[PDB]
Amino acid sequence: DNSRTRPRVGHIQFLDCLPLYWGLARTGTLLDFELTKDTPEKLSEQLVRGDLDIGPVTLVEFLKNADDLVAFPDIAVGCDGPVMSCVIVSQVPLDRLDGARVALGSTSRTSVRLAQLLLSERFGVQPDYYTCPPDLSLMMQEADAAVLIGDAALRANMIDGPRYGLDVHDLGALWKEWTGLPFVFAVWAARRDYAEREPVITRKVHEAFLASRNLSLEEVEKVAEQAARWEAFDEDTLAKYFTTLDFRFGAPQLEAVTEFARRVGPTTGFPADVKVELLKPLEHH
Template sequence: MSAAASAPGSAPGSRPVRLGRISYLNVLPIYHPLEAGWVSHGFEVVSGPPAKLNGLIRAGELDLSACSSIEYARNPERYVLLPDLAIGSFGPVKSVLLVSRVPLARLAGESVLVTAESHTSAALLRIVLERVYGVRPAYRDCRGPVRQAMALGADDPAALAIGDEALALRGDPRFPYQLDLGEVWRDWTGLPFVFGVWVARREAVAERPEELAAAARLLVESKRAGVAAIEEMASLASLIYPKLTRAEIRRYFGRLVYDLGELEQQGLSRFFQCLAEHGFIESPPSLDILGRRQGIDSQG
């Protein structure tokens, strides 16, 4: 693997660029080349679930980070999108699931336990249940992981699980009815769904434009290196997650989208429109991508 020629934040006396890393399996191909030294960098890396990273970059404690798509939609004045980086799917994703003890039609008015780790997935769940299935459950927020809540006695008829937790629950016999939110979005809209994006704080870009541009390029380089070595990523992940076979992990990676191309941008804009229609945001923002400075207006 070739290393980058320069590393942002590595100049003498310069503060390292602070980078947020989602602590889920799905981003391993993006971050592992950085962490393994395939791509040299000077980042200060902070890990956590999406909701934590959203709060950190909103508070100015990160310069650039993966974040929930809804975080950008709610605060577009704070961020610019990094080009060519996203985490999404065009169809089943397997790691964003509604798991239910009863058929979906019987969830009207029933309690659904919702993870607090991803606000994007929680909003998407409400949108598709109402728009596609005509069901309006009562949602109950869960402070921590849903499996932890279940272990402590939560017996809600259904739950929203994301990331590694969803991968663990997808074969759980207690939940014979499951809804893959990536799949239902694709079937409904014909578009990919973008669960997460990478953003830079506008203030950081204004203060350190060259370093932030270099940091964005390094992340894209790392993504390309990881995707090119996807078989190695699957083998590594099978050691980290022994409950999943290498074949399962390889299929999982194969369902993911790591780009922010034209179709992904259309899917993201369609989601932002839905957020506005359902009252999550006042109006759908344009997509302001670093280095392009030409927003792509949200459209129906």
């Protein structure tokens, strides 16, 4: 059997990419895919090691592997201000965290690093960090603060936090206050070898993502209404969440990436001036 095979494509299982999944299903794009659903750290690893051809990569893992990946333009997981689902949950003010314990949920690579950058270079505190599975209840038992992403973060933000009187700091907002910039937590990328071996499949997958994203924005109320039946959040919260997320990835978002990279690269295992290689559009005549 030497027929062409479907690209192996990753997809983040979180609510932040559920509308995208909706888009992929409605357009029929999913059937051009062999799809793997998982948490971001795992999808990133799978892409990097060759178990996927294309997928979401948490920004920090992308930047560490930028020579071997080609980023998709005009789609990303991000924010301009609040992201709602990447947070620091804390039982004390942030500037009382010097020498305190802070738990880092193991599914994140970028949010944890942003939280570390913020606490250190904005607020001037140096906690005892540790990494553990995301679980607010166990985290709050052992630590003074926790960094969460995904559904666990959104839950803390919208529900647990208010319920138990815990401060929930929005990482997107903290970065925005500090720099005035938007933030990007994950990009989409093809493995470089896949991109060069199969250039048109790669462009079509890219274009099908853009189309599916676009549709998901147009149908955001339908996604929220449907997903609300299965989640702890109601329809209004989910619609608010989906429209607060910023899935753009053009010049302003790249600028945010560049500056984040410059501030953390030296201590995060990639050059501060790492070059992001974007998938080039086909010129016509």
